[PDB]
Symmetry: D2
Subunit: 61 residues, 4 copies
């Protein structure tokens, strides 16, 4: 009984650590995705700005 109770505490500790690693990993992945979304939006803006410049050049010609 002693031996199985010690193992129970050990397993619970390991499961808690694994819960924590999974939560942390998802948290990180979410933040990565948020940062990447803003880079896409900034890129989209640069494309629009380059297109305005193209239009201005075409106009000057």
């Amino acid at each position: 009984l002693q031996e199985v109770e010690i193992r129970n505490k050990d397993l619970e500790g390991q499961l808690s650590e694994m819960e924590q690693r999974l939560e942390k990993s998802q948290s990180e992945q979410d933040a990565f995705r948020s940062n990447l979304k803003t880079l896409l939006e900034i890129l989209d803006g640069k494309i629009f700005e380059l297109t305005e410049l193209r239009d201005n050049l075409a106009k000057l010609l």
Copy 2:
């Protein structure tokens, strides 16, 4: 306690399976993220290429104007 032993042994077998599954869940998640990161690195390298090409373009415009 015969009762208590019975109960804790059943619990521990459950916990073993939860832990195995959890570990598998994390590995799957981390593998997916790795594949995501590699695919974006390709995108970054292509972006490098477009930036060099734009720089050449600006240099050619500067030459025409100078």
Copy 3:
């Protein structure tokens, strides 16, 4: 009479040439002024393009940082 006719002929031609020259110099001068203004406008566009390339470079640098 031959001398008189020649004089008249050359006077007429000179007057014609002065007009053609005036017209051509005015055309050349306008053309060149327009080309100067065109080049100046393109210079501003080049400066703007450079800013956009710099901002793309920053974006790229930020993507590279995210990818560690």
Copy 4:
């Protein structure tokens, strides 16, 4: 009469020369301006291609995200 004809003939040679010079300058100016324009049109077409390539990149990024 003799002085006057000489004067008007010398003037005519002057003007004819000025005309030749102007014809030549107009030709050269027109050529340089056309070449300049054509060369600029090249850079406009290349810029268009870069914008296209960047829009493709943006589309791949968006697809990796969604």
